[PDB]
């Protein structure tokens, strides 16, 4: 009946402290399409995050990219917070510059 | 270029 999202948090280019980049949260493999995605900076919601247009894979499951421009530093922590009908509570995935 | 044809279930 339903499929839970796969979540990946990563940067567009390899992370370099002080250099402008894009923080991405890619959600895929989910059904139904309604989903809530937030990008977090030190646990707080980043405003004006943009997202791709709804599309789906060969198996009908949906995918979306949520993204924002950011300048990584050593001390700031980033994450992606996802809620979907399949999740009892929001799922948080931390940005690990090695994943 | 999209298909202009319309079909119903």
């Amino acid at each position: 009946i339903q499929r839970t999202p796969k979540i990946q948090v990563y940067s567009r280019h390899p992370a370099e402290n002080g250099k402008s980049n894009f923080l991405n949260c890619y959600v895929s493999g989910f059904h139904p399409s309604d989903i809530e995605v937030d990008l977090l900076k030190n646990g707080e919601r980043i405003e004006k995050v943009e997202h791709s247009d709804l599309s789906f894979s060969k198996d009908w499951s949906f995918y979306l990219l949520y993204y924002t421009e950011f300048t990584p530093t050593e001390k700031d922590e980033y994450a992606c917070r996802v809620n979907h009908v399949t999740l009892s509570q929001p799922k948080i995935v931390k940005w690990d510059r090695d994943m | 270029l999209r298909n202009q044809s319309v079909f119903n279930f």
Partner: protein, 276 residues
């Protein structure tokens, strides 16, 4: 080499919250080139690639009219499906449709597609012959009977073999700078000690286009299919894609592992190892 054009459509009902939301997007390979969203300020077929911007106002009116009429047929079809599946009018449901064509390097038709899903499950699909149907259940068989009586497959075949292939060829020529350029992956291997008995080797591929790629790990020349963790290929947001594959290796055996990378942009498959 080979290319594809695809149009994707999703309608989602929302009883008590107005009419269903309709979103459709068009792709050539892994490049989005058009979108239409019924919830937009002024819903219209909107260009999303530089090579489609040259199309005239007549072209955009034609595509916009088709999207608006597909949004309406989808609303009707969502009501039909409630009847076919004996469902309440209270719940939210999803209708998906994908159609398009694949062409070879010579631009000749490889295969055509036209398939629908209800609530994420196969409903009805046009077979590869472009002349017969695969219905998933007794509700889709009702649509099959209707579509056989109306000779829908013949109408679809004419589009898929005609307009679909010719316009795909036109877009490949207009967009040759990007659509016909493969960007090879930028690769590297990282090492993360997990403990003093094991370590992670991660093989990376970044900055590639198209999305299709193969990353594999071997131990002593033997594929590690079961022991490899493979992330789904993901968009970078600059047209390119990324992927990684990881293996947990016994400490001191790192040089027994090799990463193998295959991509259209590479004339020869790559072999990488953790350096040093």
């Amino acid at each position: 080499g080979s290319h594809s054009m695809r149009y994707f459509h999703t309608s989602v009902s929302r009883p008590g919250r107005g009419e269903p939301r309709f979103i459709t997007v068009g792709y050539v390979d892994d490049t989005l080139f058009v979108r239409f969203d019924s919830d937009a300020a002024s819903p219209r077929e909107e260009g999303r690639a530089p090579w489609i911007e040259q199309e005239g106002p007549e072209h955009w009116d034609r595509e916009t009219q088709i999207c608006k009429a597909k949004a309406q047929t989808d609303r009707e079809d969502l009501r039909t499906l409630l009847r076919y599946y004996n469902q309440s009018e209270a719940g939210s449901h999803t209708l998906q449709n994908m159609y398009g064509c694949d062409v070879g390097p010579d631009g000749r038709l490889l295969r055509g597609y036209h398939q629908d899903a209800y609530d994420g499950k196969d409903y009805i699909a046009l077979n590869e012959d472009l002349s017969s149907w695969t219905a998933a259940d007794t509700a889709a068989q009702i649509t099959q009977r209707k579509w056989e009586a109306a000779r829908v497959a013949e109408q679809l075949r004419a589009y898929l073999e005609g307009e679909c292939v010719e316009w795909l060829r036109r877009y490949l020529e207009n967009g040759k700078e990007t659509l016909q350029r493969a960007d090879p992956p930028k690769t590297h291997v990282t090492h993360h000690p997990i403990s003093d008995h094991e370590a992670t080797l991660r093989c990376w591929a970044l900055g590639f286009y198209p999305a299709e790629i193969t990353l594999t790990w071997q131990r002593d020349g033997e594929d590690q299919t079961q022991d490899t963790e493979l992330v789904e290929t993901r968009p970078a947001g600059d047209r390119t894609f990324q992927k990684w594959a990881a293996v947990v290796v016994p400490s001191g055996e790192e040089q027994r592992y090799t990463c193998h990378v295959q991509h259209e942009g590479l004339p020869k498959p790559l072999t990488l190892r953790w350096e040093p």
